[PDB]
């Protein structure tokens, strides 16, 4: 849904999406061939589903067709120091894909902005909408517009027939954060069909026991998960499916 959005925020006002109480499957993203770039700076570009993370932040904005590789830790430049800045320690992935056919219009649409210059470099994971007038020392800028001081935000000129370097490109950067809070967004769990009346190693929601499974007459309470014996030995489980 967030990839199929109708409106995309500017780089200086990149939208952040926080995901919780949800199971995220990356198989569709991996198998989607519409992405022109899937370089990931995380621990593994395939074990993302297997890994368990507490929370995920998605940053989506539109930049030039070029400098897509420029969105990375370090890599000093205009976009790095005066636009959305990626921290030097980043464990997420960078996804880029072309969207010329829908977001590009004739006449050079100016709905997309970007920050040209500020007093200091932008800290990682920062959003700036103040758009205060930049000063160049002399500061003769008590009026709306003065010398050496103008609007720091510049409007992108995007054209479908323009060179691919100047063509609209979509980048979505996802960040994985580890905190003291318990994990709430991890990959789907694969479950096989149960087999009964056979000594089979089983993993019932982390129980990890071995034995023979057979139907039972005991009445588990609805909230209960797995029973126990006098000697605290697991002797009954409730099937989650």
């Amino acid at each position: 849904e967030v990839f199929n959005a109708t409106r995309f925020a500017s780089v200086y006002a990149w939208n952040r999406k926080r995901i919780s109480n949800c199971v995220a499957d990356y198989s569709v993203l991996y198998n989607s061939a519409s992405f022109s770039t899937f370089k990931c700076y995380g621990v593994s570009p395939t074990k993302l589903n297997d890994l368990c993370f507490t929370n995920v932040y998605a940053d989506s904005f539109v930049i030039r067709g070029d400098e897509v590789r420029q969105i990375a830790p370090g890599q000093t430049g205009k976009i790095a120091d005066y636009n959305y800045k990626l921290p030097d320690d980043f464990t997420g992935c960078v996804i880029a894909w072309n969207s010329n056919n829908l977001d590009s219009k004739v006449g050079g649409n100016y709905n997309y902005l970007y920050r040209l210059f500020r007093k200091s470099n932008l800290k990682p994971f920062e959003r700036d909408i103040s758009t205060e007038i930049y000063q160049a020392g002399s500061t003769p800028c008590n009026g709306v517009e003065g010398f050496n001081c103008y609007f720091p935000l510049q409007s992108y000129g995007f054209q479908p027939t323009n060179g691919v370097g100047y063509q609209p490109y979509r980048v979505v950067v996802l960040s994985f954060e580890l905190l003291h809070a318990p994990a709430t967004v991890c990959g789907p769990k694969k479950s096989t069909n149960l087999v009964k009346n056979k000594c089979v190693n089983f993993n019932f929601n982390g129980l990890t026991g071995t034995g023979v499974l057979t139907e039972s007459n005991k009445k588990f309470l609805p909230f209960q998960q797995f029973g126990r014996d006098i000697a605290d030995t697991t002797d009954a489980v409730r099937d989650p499916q």
Partner: antibody
Amino acid sequence: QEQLEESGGGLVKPEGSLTLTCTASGFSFSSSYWICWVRQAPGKGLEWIGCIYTGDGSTYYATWAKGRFTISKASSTTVTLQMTSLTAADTATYFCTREGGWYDLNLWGPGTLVTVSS
Amino acid sequence: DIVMTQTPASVEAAVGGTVTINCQASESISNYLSWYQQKPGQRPKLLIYYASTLASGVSSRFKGSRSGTEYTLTISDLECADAATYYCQSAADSISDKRHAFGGGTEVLVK
């Protein structure tokens, strides 16, 4: 209006390093894919070599001169310049031209003259 | 690197006339092509935005046809000012890597 200007030494020793200054009346701070590596041979013709983006990515050199030529854009007041090494019978004239949309060169700069011989 | 060729630079006309010049490349991409005016002893000028357009401040006779893999440009009504060599520039189409291949060009001679 927007205009590109160049300045450089008239003479250089053979296989000597010479710095080519370039200034632009327009700021061109973030969206200028300008090229000053187009090599105009005297009476023969131009030959593009490399470009530069404002993002400090160094872009590409096309392996025309391999790595002996480099771009170090100082930014500031539209200050851009290039270093040359192992220059041997290189052509005198080359212009700092700005690149607009559709991968073109809208505005070129004044000619420059360099002599490889001592 | 992008390899390219072009027609011989010899162009001869007596009074005006229409002369066609073909400047093509084997791997040149579509819709990304621009020519220029190279006045001897003068600054080069742009005349076309892309794919045989007019740009701004250019005579309506500076047209062309994209056609197939070959790229042909048509120039008519040659004059003393128009008696300057023209250069065709081609560029690659890729974000990761791009390069330009300047042509040998054709020289306009007016009798």
